[PDB]
Amino acid sequence: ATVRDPAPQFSGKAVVDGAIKEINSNDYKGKYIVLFFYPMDFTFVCPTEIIAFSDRYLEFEKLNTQVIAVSCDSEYSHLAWVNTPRKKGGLGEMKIPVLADKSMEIARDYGVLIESAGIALRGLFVIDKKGTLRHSTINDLPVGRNVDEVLRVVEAFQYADENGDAIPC
Amino acid sequence: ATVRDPAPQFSGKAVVDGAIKEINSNDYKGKYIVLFFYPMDFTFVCPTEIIAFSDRYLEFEKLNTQVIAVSCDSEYSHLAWVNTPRKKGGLGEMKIPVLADKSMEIARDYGVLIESAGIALRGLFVIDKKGTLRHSTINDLPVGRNVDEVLRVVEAFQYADEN
Amino acid sequence: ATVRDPAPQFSGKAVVDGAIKEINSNDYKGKYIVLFFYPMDFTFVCPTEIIAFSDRYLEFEKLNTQVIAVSCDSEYSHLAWVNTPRKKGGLGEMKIPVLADKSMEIARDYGVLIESAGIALRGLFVIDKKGTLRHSTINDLPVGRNVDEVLRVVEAFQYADEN
Amino acid sequence: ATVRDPAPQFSGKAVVDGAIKEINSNDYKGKYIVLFFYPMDFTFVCPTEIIAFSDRYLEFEKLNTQVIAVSCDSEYSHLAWVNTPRKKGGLGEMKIPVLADKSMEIARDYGVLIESAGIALRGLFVIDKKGTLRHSTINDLPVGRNVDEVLRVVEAFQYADEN
Amino acid sequence: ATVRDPAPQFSGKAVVDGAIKEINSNDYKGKYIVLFFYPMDFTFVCPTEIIAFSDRYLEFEKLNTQVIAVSCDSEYSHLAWVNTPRKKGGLGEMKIPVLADKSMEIARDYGVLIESAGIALRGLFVIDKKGTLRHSTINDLPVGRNVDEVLRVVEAFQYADENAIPCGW
Amino acid sequence: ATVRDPAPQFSGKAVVDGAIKEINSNDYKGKYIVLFFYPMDFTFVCPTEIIAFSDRYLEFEKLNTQVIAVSCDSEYSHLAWVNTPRKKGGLGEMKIPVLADKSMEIARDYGVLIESAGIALRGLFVIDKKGTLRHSTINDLPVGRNVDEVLRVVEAFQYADE
Amino acid sequence: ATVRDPAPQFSGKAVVDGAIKEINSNDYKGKYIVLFFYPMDFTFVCPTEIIAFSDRYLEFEKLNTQVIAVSCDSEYSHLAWVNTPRKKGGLGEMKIPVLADKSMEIARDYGVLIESAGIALRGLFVIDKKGTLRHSTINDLPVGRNVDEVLRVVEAFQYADENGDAIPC
Amino acid sequence: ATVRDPAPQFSGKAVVDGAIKEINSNDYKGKYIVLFFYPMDFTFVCPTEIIAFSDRYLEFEKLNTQVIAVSCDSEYSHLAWVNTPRKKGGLGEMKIPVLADKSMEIARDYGVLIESAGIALRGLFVIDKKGTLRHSTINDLPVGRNVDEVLRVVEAFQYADEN
Amino acid sequence: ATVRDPAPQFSGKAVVDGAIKEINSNDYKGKYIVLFFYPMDFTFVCPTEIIAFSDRYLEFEKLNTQVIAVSCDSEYSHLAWVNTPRKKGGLGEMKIPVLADKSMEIARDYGVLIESAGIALRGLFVIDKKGTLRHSTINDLPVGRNVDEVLRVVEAFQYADEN
Amino acid sequence: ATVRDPAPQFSGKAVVDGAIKEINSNDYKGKYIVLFFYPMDFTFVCPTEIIAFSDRYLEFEKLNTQVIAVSCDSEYSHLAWVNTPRKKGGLGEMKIPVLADKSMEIARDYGVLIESAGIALRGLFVIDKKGTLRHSTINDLPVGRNVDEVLRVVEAFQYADEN
C-alpha cells in the first residue's frame, strides 16, 4: 500500500455524535479523507492532539475533508472515553468519528500495526476524492502531529489538482 | 491445545489491586488456575458473571485456585473499568486479576479468539498444579457461565487427584 | 470445529427404545441437540451421569431438545449394556438414544477423540435448530457433567434466540 | 507388513484369568504366537470359533505356542462378554487371552482393519519364536477359521525350522 | 489390494491341456476363482501341492470354481515342466491351468511378489463371482497349502452368500 | 522498512561543498539525519523546497542533525544543477550534501521509488543517533515539505530521548 | 535477447529540436535504426562521439537510418545539457534525438545496464526495417565509437538484403 | 549406461559345468567379458547361437575373454535346459556359464529389459579388463548373433588396446 | 528410447552424388534404412569403413535398403572431403548420402553423442520400412564395422518380415 | 558473461603454423586477446576477413595482442582448410591460430552460438591482460569485420590503461 495507489477501504463501528454508528469509506466520496491512527485509549498522557483535531474539525469540513480517528480498541471503550471529561483525561465531546479497529484489519492494511503490541503506530493518511493516497505521515509513539501542517498539505493537494502544477522560475 | 495436554503458558499486564502489575501463569504454581475469558470491556450489559466470580473469589481461594479474568482489551481500558463504579456498570473493586490480551495472542493459544471480530469467545479453562488442562467450557457470546459449576468441577478434580 | 460454526452432522446405529436402529442428525432439525460423549461401556464406575440424563429426559423434551449419548463402542456392546440391569452396573432402560461411533469418526469430527486410547473425552455439545454450535464442554475422564447446568445453558440460548 | 518380515510387536490390556491384565508380545519369546482377529463382541452369531480355539488351547500348548485373541473392543467389553455365559451367547471361561485393541493400531499394523467400519477382518497370523511372521490368513467377515489347519501350519513350520 | 475389495484382473499365456493358450480372468465370471501362487518351476522339491490341486480339480468343478496355478516363470518353462514325468520330479498331466507371470505384474498386484528374488510367495486367493476378494492365505516358502481347507472356505462363502444362526436364549 | 527499525544504511557520491565527494551514512555519528527525497533534477519548477533547507541549514546543524537531499540522478547532473544559477531555476550554492542514487537502491531501501518512472517520491526520513527510524513523511509529487515541521519533529524526538 | 532476434521496442520522452517530445520506435518504420547508448550526461569528458553522430546525421539519413542516442538520465537533464553550449562542454544543438531511459527498462532490455551503477555501457545496436537486430557493439566506458564503421555495417546489411546473396571463389 | 562408461557389475547363481554355483563379474577382472542376453529357455526354436558360443568357447578363452550367457529365467530352469538333450531341443553340455537374472535387475542395468514382457532383448556387451564398456549389440528377438563378428570385435579391441 | 520403438525421424543437408541436397528420413519409405555414424571428417586414418559401405551400396539397393553415413560436421566439410581424392585421405566418390548433423540433434536422439568431445560414437542403426528400430550396434571409436554383418542382419529381418 | 566482467577461459586444439597443437587462453598473459568467431569452414565465399587478420597480424603483435580465430569445426577440418590453397578457396598459410570448438562450449560461453544450427555468429571479443572483457562486437552472418576498427579499439583501451 503506497502513495499514488488506491487507499484501502475501511468500515466499522465508530462513535458519531455521542452514539455508536457504523461508518464506511464509500460514504465519503467527492471528499478528502484523513485517517488518523493513535495507539490506545485511557492512556495516562493527556490526549491533546486528537482533541485538537476534533475542535478544529470545522476547518476540515470547510475543505471538504472528513477526519476520522481510529484505534485498535473496541467502539465501546471509545464511547466510554467520549463520555469521560477531558479534565479527567477523557475526550469529552468529539466532533469527529472515533473508529474501532478491534479486528486490526485496518491498521495492517495501512501498515501501521505493531503485531507484537497489538497497537497501531501514530500514522496519518490523506486520501483524495478519487480514493487515492496522496500522503502518509508515520510517527513513533512519543511524537504527535500538528493540525496546521495537515491542513497545509490538504490545501496544497486541492490546489495542485484544480491548478495543474505550475510556476516556473 | 486440548484437554489432557499442558496448557499454554501466559503472561502480561493485568489490573490487580486497582493498580497495573505484570503477572505470569507460573506465579500461581501449586495452585489450580481458572482462566476466564470475556469478549470486551464497557459493554452495555451489566457484568454480573465476572463480578460473581470476583465476589465469590474466597470460595476459590479455599479450594486453592487462582481465578483470572482475561480479555483482548488494553490494560488501560481494564483499569478504567475497575475504577468505574458498579452502579454505572463498572467492575468496582476486583479481588481477582483482570488480564490484558491486546496482542490477542492468548485468546489465539486457547483457540477462543474470533479472528473476524478481534474478540474472545466465552471460554473457561481449568489447569491443575502440574500445568495440565483438565477442563474447557466454551460458550457462544449470549450465554454466561455459572460460578457453582466451576467450583464443582474444581472440587471434583481435586478429589479425583487425591483419590 | 469451533463455536458459532455449523456443528458436524452425525449418523450411525444407536440403541433406541431397546432396539438397534439407524439414526441421523438431520432427523432432528428444528430441535436443539445435546451431544453427550462418554469414554467406554462396562466401566466399573457406576454410570450415574448418563442415567441421570436418561431419567431427566422429559425436562429436555419439554424444551424440545434431543439428547444423544454417544461412544466409540459397537452398537452391540451398547445393546448389551442396555440389556444389563442397573444393579449389575448396566444402563437398564435408556430413554435417550445411545449411539455407536465404532469408526471413531464422530469423536474425531468433534475433536474429543484420544488417538492413543481410541476413546472419547467427556465432551458435551449444544446445537441450535440451524445446526450451529452454541456450546461445548470438555471434561477430562475423571469428572462428570451436571444435568441442571446443561438445561440452564439450553434455556439461556433459547431465550437469546427468542428475543 | 508382509510374510518373512519381523511381525509387528503388540501389547495391551487383555482378559486372561477372568481378570484384566496387561500383556505384551515380548512376554512370549521362545514360543510361537498365533494372533487371532475377530470383528466385534456381542454379535448375535454364536462365537463358535473363538470358543473352539480356547477349548482346544491344550493342543497349542503342546506345540509351545501361545494363541491370542484380539479385537477392537475395550477390555471392559471383553470382560463383560467373558462374564456372559455361553448359553446366552457369551464366551464364558476363556483359556486364551482376549486382547483389546481400542486404538485400532494393532489391526492397522496387521492391515486387517476396515477403517470405514472400525472393525477388524477375520485375520490370523503365525509368528515364530524369533518373532518373524510365517503365515497370514485373511478371511472376509462371514467365514471362520479351522483350528486343525492352524495346528497343521504350526507343526509344519516348526518341522521346517528344525530341518 | 485387500479382502473385500475387487481382486485385480489377470490374463496371460498359460499351459492348458498340454498347449500354450491365452487365458483371461473375465472368462470365469460365473465361477469362483482360486489363484494359486508358487515360487518356481524345476525346484528340487517334489511339487506335491500343485499336483494335489490338479488331481482334486473335479471337486472344485463340482463347486463351480476355477483353480489356476500361477508362477513368474515363462509358459515355455511351464510346458517343459508339464512334459516332465512326475516320477522324474515333473508335473506330468495338469488338469488345471498353469499361468505364466513373466512380467511379474500379477504377483505384484496380489502383493505376493518378492522383488529382490523375482519370485512369488506361496499365496492363495479366493475370488467370488462378483470378482471380489474373499480370502487370502500367504505361506512362507517351506510350508504348503491344504486342498481340503480351500474347499471348505469356498463352500463356506458360497453358503454364506446364498444364506447366520444366533446362539441366543 | 518500518518505523522503530534501524534505518537502511546508504552511501554514494554526492555534491557537498560544491565538489563531488564520496559520502556515507556512518560519517555522521552523534547526529540525527534528515533524508530528503525529491524526484528529479532540472525540473522547471523553482526548487524552493531544497533551497529552503539549504538556507535554513544552520537551524538543523544547531540541533546536531544532518540534512541530506537525495535523488536518482547522477552526481554529475547534481553538480550541473548546483552550478546553475537560481535565476535560471538552478540551485546555486548548496550547504547540504546532495546525493546521487543512480542505482535507485537507496530509494528502494526507503521504499519511495516509483519503479515505473525511475524517480523517488517526496519522502522524508528522520534517523536518530542510534540509527533507528523515527518518522517518515511521504508526499505525492505536487506537494512539498515544510521546514518548521521537520524541525518541530526533530525537536520532539530529541527532547523525548533527553 | 540476441542478434537475429527481433529487437525490443522502446519508447519514451526524448529531446527533439530543443524540445521534449514523446518518441516511439514504431515512428521510424521502413527505416534502419541505430540505437546509441551512452552512460551519463554532464560528464567532464568532451562528448566528441555523440557530437560526431549528431553532425554526420545527414549521412545516416541518406542511407535511410535513424540514429537515436539514449541514456538513463531524465529528459530534463537531457534538455539542460542540450541547452549548454559545446564550448562549455555541453551538447549544444543536437540534430539527432536524445532519449531518456530513467526507468532503465530499455538499457535492461538491451542488456547494457550496469545494475550496480544504474548506468548503460557504451552500447550500439543496428536494427533493420523488419525490426530484427543485425549487429551489436558494446564497449566498456573508457572507449568511444566510430561513425564510419557503423556506416560500413549498415550499408553492408542493406547491400546483402538487396543483393541475394553470396559469390563463390 | 553408455559406451566408454564403466559397465555395471553383475552377479548371481549360474549353472556351471552342469551344477549351480554363485558367480560374480569381478571374478573375471583380468579378462574381457562378453555378456550374452537371451529372451527365454525352452523356446520351440533350436538354440543354435548360444550353443555355437559354448562350442567355440575355446577361441574366446584363447583371447582371454569370458563369455557369459544370461536370461531372466530361474537358475533351476536353466539347469533343466542344460540337462535336457539337444536332440529334444535342450542345450546339453554348456562350456560357458548360464546366469539367472530372475530379479530382472541385470537386464534393466544393461537396458535390454522389456518391462512389459519380462524378457531380455538379444543384447550383447563387450567389457574390457578395466571394466569399461567397449561395445554393445542389440538385436530384436527374431535375429541372432554371429560368433565370428564378436571375435573380430574382441581381437580388434585387444589390438587397439596395445598400440 | 530403444529397439522395438519407432526410430527417431531425422533430417538435414547431406552430400548426394557429389552435390549438397536437403534430405529427410521420410523420403525413404517402403525401404529399410541404415543409419551409419562416424566420429569426424579429415582424420589422418584411412576412411576404409565408409568407403567400404559406399562401394557395396548396390548390394543394399538389392535389399531395398538405404545406407546413410552421418556425422556432426558441416555439409561443407563433407563436400570438401568428398571432393578430396582418396589418395591423401579423402572420400572420393560416395555412392551413399553423407549427412551433416551440425546441430548434433541427431547424434543425441540416437544417443551416440559424446557431449564432451562434440563427436558421435561409431554407432549403427537398422530401421524397418515401418520405421521401428530393429538393431543397434555401437562401437567405441577405435573399432570399425563390418559390412557383411549389416547385410546378414538386414536379410534376417526382411526374411522375418516375410515370414 | 558480459562486458566489464572477467572473460571466460577457453582452450582446445587449434591449427598453429600448419600443424595441430593444443592452445590455451592463459598461454597469453601480458597480452590482449582478440577472439574471432566465424560460422563455418569451406564456405563458397572467399574468406577475405580471416585472411585479412592473418595477413595484418604484425600490427597486432606490435600492439601486444594475440588474435585467435575460432569455429565450431574440428581441428582436422581446420587443418584441411589451411592445407587448401587460397586460389582454390582455402586459407592457405595462416599466421594466426585457428581454434576448434567442436564441443561448442566456447561459442556458448561467449553466447554467440546458434543452438539450432550449431554454428557461431560473427562475434568478436577483446580481452585485456587482466583477462577482463573490454569489448564485444556481434555481427549477423552476412557481414564481416574491419581490422582497422579492431586495432583502433585495442589502441584506445591500452591508451586508457596507461593514462
Contact H73 E73 (CB under 8 A): yes
Query: CB of C151 within 8 A of CB of C52?
Result: no
Secondary structure of C81-129 as H, E, C letters: HHCCCHHHCCCCCCCCCEEECCCCHHHHHCCCEECCCCEECEEEEEECC
Identify whether the C-beta of residue B51 lies closer than 8 Å to the C-beta of residue B86: yes
Give the pairing of strands B65-71 and B32-37. parallel
Residue with cell 592452445: J23
G103 with F115: Cβ contact below 8 A: yes
Compute the nearest-CA separation of G26 from chain J (Å): 23
F contacts of G72 (beta carbons < 8 Å): 102, 118
Residue B125, helix vs strand vs coil: strand
Contact A140 F3 (CB under 8 A): yes
From the list A46, A117, A138, A156, the catalytic residue is A46
Residue E17 dihedral angles phi and psi, to the nearest 5°: 50, 35
The single residue listed with the C-alpha cell 482533541 is: A51
- Residue found by looking up cell 481465578 in the block: B67
Contacts with H136 from chain I: Cβ below 8 Å: 136-138
Rounded to the nearest 5°, which phi and psi values hold at J27?
-65, -25
- Nearest CA among F68, F83, F81 for reference residue F11: F68
User: What kind and span of H or E run contains H158?
Assistant: helix H147-162
Rounded to a whole number of angstroms, the distance between the first and last alpha carbons of chain J is 27
Q: Among G3, G144, G169, whose Cβ lies nearest the Cβ of J138? A: G3
- Cβ atoms of I134 and H140 within 8 Å: the answer is yes
Q: Is I33 exposed, middle or buried (0-12, 13-18, 19+ CB in 10 A)?
A: buried
Nearest to E143 among D46, D138, D156 (CB): D156
Contacts of C3 in chain B (CB under 8 A): 121, 138-140
Partner residue facing G138 (CB), from J3, J144, J157: J3
Q: Which residues of E touch D (CB under 8 A)?
A: 2-4, 111, 114, 121, 133-140, 142-144, 146, 149, 152-153, 156-157, 160-161, 164-169
Cα–Cα distance measured from residue A20 to residue A38, given in angstroms and rounded to the nearest whole number: 19
Q: Domains in chain I: how many in total? A: 1
**Angle, nearest 10°, between helix axes G75-82 and F75-82?**
50
What is the C-alpha to C-alpha distance for residues I91 and I96, in angstroms, rounded to an integer? Answer: 11
Q: How far is CA I160 from CA H41, I84, I134, in A?
A: 21, 41, 11
The answer to whether the beta carbons of residues F129 and F32 sit under 8 Å apart is: yes
J64 CA to centre of own chain = 15
Nearest alpha carbon to residue F20 among F100, F128, F88? F100
CB neighbours of residue I92 within 10 Å? 15
Report the greatest alpha carbon distance in chain D.
Answer: 47
What is the spatial distance between Cα F121 and Cα H78, in angstroms, rounded to a whole number? Answer: 85
- Helix/strand/coil for D47: coil
Q: Which residues of G131-168 are buried (b: 16+ CB within 10 A; e: fewer)?
A: eebbbbbbbbbebbbbbebbbebbebbbebeeeeeeee
Residue B53: how many CB atoms within 10 A of its CB? 23
Residues of F taking part in catalysis: 46
For C156, name the nearest residue in chain B, comparing CA atoms only: B143
> Of H121, H116, H118, whose CA–CA distance to H38 is shortest?
H121
Tally Cβ neighbours within 10 Å of residue F134. 26
Burial classification of residue I35, based on how many CB atoms lie within 10 Å of its CB (0-12 exposed, 13-18 middle, 19 or more buried): buried
Q: Which residues contact B139 (CB under 8 A, 6 or more apart)?
A: B121, B122, B123, B145, C3, C134, C135, C153
The residues, any chain, with a CB within 8 Å of residue H162's CB and separated by 6 or more, are none
- C-alpha distances (whole Å) from C71 to each of B158, C1, D102, D103, H106 are 26, 19, 12, 14, 56
Q: Is B5:C141 a contact under the CB 8 Å cutoff? A: no
Write down which chains contact chain D via at least 3 CB pairs under 8 A.
C, E
Alpha helices in H56-111 (DSSP H): 57-62, 75-83, 105-109
Count of other CB atoms within 10 angstroms of residue F61: 14
Q: What's the rounded Cα separation, in Å, for the pair J40 and J136? A: 20
Return d(Cα E32, Cα D67) in angstroms, integer: 32
Sole residue written with cell 485373511: D138
Range of the domain at B10: 1-163
Which experimental technique did the depositors report for determining this structure?
X-ray
Cβ <8 Å between D88 and E168: yes
Cell of I26: 521420410
Enumerate neighbours of J (3 or more CB pairs within 8 A): G, I
Q: Give dist(CA G32, CA D111) in Å, integer.
A: 76
User: How far, in Å, CA of E70 to CA of E25, rounded?
Assistant: 12
Q: F121 and A3 in contact by Cβ < 8 A? A: yes
Q: Which of I12, I90, I111 is nearest to I46 (CA)?
A: I90
Q: Do chains B and I touch (3 or more CB pairs under 8 A)?
A: no
What is residue I27's DSSP assignment?
G
CA–CA distance, A111 with B4 (Å, rounded to integer): 39
Q: At J57, phi and psi to the nearest 5?
A: -60, -35
Distance CA F16, CA F98 (A): 6
Whether the Cβ atoms of residue A61 and residue A28 lie closer than 8 Å to each other: no
Select which of H46, H111, H130, H155 is catalytic: H46
Distances (CA, A) of C79 to A114, D42, D117, D120: 58, 9, 18, 20
Q: What is the spatial distance between Cα B75 and Cα F27, in angstroms, rounded to a whole number?
A: 43
Pick the residue of C102, C109, C119, C141 with the most D CBs within 10 A to test the interface with D by mutation.
C102
Dist. CA B69–CA B98, nearest whole Å: 5
Q: Is H12 left (phi over 0), alpha (psi -120 to 50) or beta?
A: left
**Among I46, I58, I88, I159, which one carries the catalytic annotation?**
I46
Distance CA D99, CA D78 (A): 8
Per DSSP, the three-state class of B17 is coil
Identify which of E13, E86, E11, E101 has the alpha carbon closest to the alpha carbon of residue E50.
E86
| Residue whose C-alpha cell reads 582452450 in the numeric block | J11
- Total beta-carbon pairs less than 8 A apart between chain B and chain C: 66
> Would the CB atoms of D146 and E149 count as touching at under 8 Å?
yes
G143 vs J46, J111, J153: nearest CB: J153
Instruction: Return the closest-CA partner of residue D72 out of D118, D35, D116.
Output: D118
Alpha helices in chain F (DSSP H): 48-55, 57-62, 75-82, 105-109, 147-161
Contacts of F80 in chain G (CB under 8 A): 41-42, 77, 80-81, 84
By CB atoms closer than 10 A (0-12, 13-18, 19+), residue D24 is exposed
Burial class (CB in 10 A: 0-12, 13-18, 19+), J142: middle
Counting CB pairs under 8 A, whether chains C and A reach 3 or more, is no
- State the Cα–Cα distance between residues J119 and I103, nearest whole angstrom: 8
Would you give the DSSP letter of residue A168? B
Please state the φ and ψ torsions of residue F138, each to the nearest 5 degrees: -130, 120
Q: Which residue of E has its CA nearest to D137?
A: E137
Q: Do J73 and I72 touch (CB under 8 A)?
A: no
The answer to whether the CB of J126 falls within 8 A of the CB of J135 is: yes
Q: Which helix (H) or strand (E) holds J157?
A: helix J147-162
Grid coordinates standing for H92? 546339453
- What is the distance between the alpha carbons of residues B150 and B135, in angstroms, rounded to a whole number? 10
**Searching chain E, which residue's CA lies closest to the CA of residue D5?**
E140
C131: left (phi over 0), alpha (psi -120 to 50) or beta: left
The alpha-carbon gap from E119 to the nearest alpha carbon of chain H, in Å, equals 7
Q: How far is CA C127 from CA C53, C58, F16, in A?
A: 17, 18, 75
Rounded to whole angstroms, how far apart are CA atoms H154 and H148? 10
A22 conformational bin, left if phi > 0, alpha if psi -120 to 50, beta if neither = beta
| Contact: B103, A118; criterion CB under 8 Å | yes
How far, in Å, CA of E15 to CA of E33, rounded?
Answer: 17
Contact H104, H113 (CB under 8 A): yes
Q: The domain spanning residue G56 has which CATH number? A: 3.40.30.10
Q: Contact, I16 vs I80, CB < 8 A?
A: no
- Are E143 and D137 in contact (CB < 8 Å)? no
Residues closing a segment before a gap in chain I (C–N exceeding 2.5 Å): none
D42 CA: distance to closest CA in chain E (Å): 11
Q: How far is J89 from chain G (nearest CA, A)?
A: 6
Are H125 and H95 a contacting pair, CB within 8 Å? Answer: no
Q: How much is the CA Rg of chain B, to the nearest whole Å? A: 15
Peptide bond into J128 cis (omega under 30): no
CA distance D117 to chain C (A): 5
Contact E/A (≥3 CB pairs under 8 Å): no
Closest CA to C14 of C90, C94, C117: C94
Rounded distance between C-alpha atoms, residue C122 and residue E144, angstroms: 51
Residues of J in contact with I108 (CB under 8 A): none
Q: Which of E45, E46, E117, E160 is catalytic?
A: E46
Nearest CA in chain G to J113: G2
| Contact between A3 and F140 using a beta-carbon 8 Å cutoff | yes
Distance of CA I35 to the CA centre of its chain: 4
φ, ψ for residue F38, nearest 5 deg: -135, 150
Cβ G134–J152 below 8 Å, yes or no? no
Residues from chain E that touch D117, judged by Cβ atoms under 8 A, are none
Touching status, chains D and H (3+ beta-carbon pairs under 8 Å): no
Q: Residue E7 and residue D138: Cα distance in Å, rounded?
A: 14
J81: enclosing H helix or E strand: helix J75-83
What is the DSSP pairing of strand J65-71 with strand J32-37?
parallel
Angle, helices H147-162 vs H48-55, to 10°: value is: 50
List CB contacts (< 8 A) between E121 and chain D.
2-4
Q: Choose among B133, B139, B152: nearest Cβ to C135.
A: B139
Min Cα–Cα distance to chain G from F108, Å = 13
d(CA H46, CA H72): 18
Answer yes or no: are the C-beta atoms of I14 and I78 closer than 8 Å: yes
Return left, alpha or beta for G42; rule: phi > 0 is left, psi -120 to 50 is alpha, else beta: left
**Cα dist from E63 to E59, E152, F49, whole Å:** 7, 11, 104
Q: Find, in chain D, the residue whose alpha carbon is nearest to that of E134.
A: D140
Residues 6+ apart with CB under 8 A from C162: none
Contact F/H (≥3 CB pairs under 8 Å)? no
Hey, what's the cell of I124? 549403427
Interface contact flag, D77 C73, Cβ < 8 Å:
yes
CA-to-CA distance for B10 and J139, rounded, in angstroms?
Answer: 72
Alpha-carbon distances of G131 from E163, G163, H83, H110, J140, rounded to whole Å: 85, 19, 79, 52, 14
| Residue E9: Cβ within 10 Å count | 11
User: What would you report as the CA-atom Rg of chain E, rounded to the nearest whole angstrom?
Assistant: 16
I81 within 8 A of I99, measured Cβ to Cβ: no
User: Do the beta carbons of residue F118 and residue F30 sit within 8 Å?
Assistant: no
| Residue H46 falls in the annotated catalytic set | yes
* Cβ neighbours, 10 Å, residue C117: 16
DSSP-assigned beta bridge partners for residue E133: E127
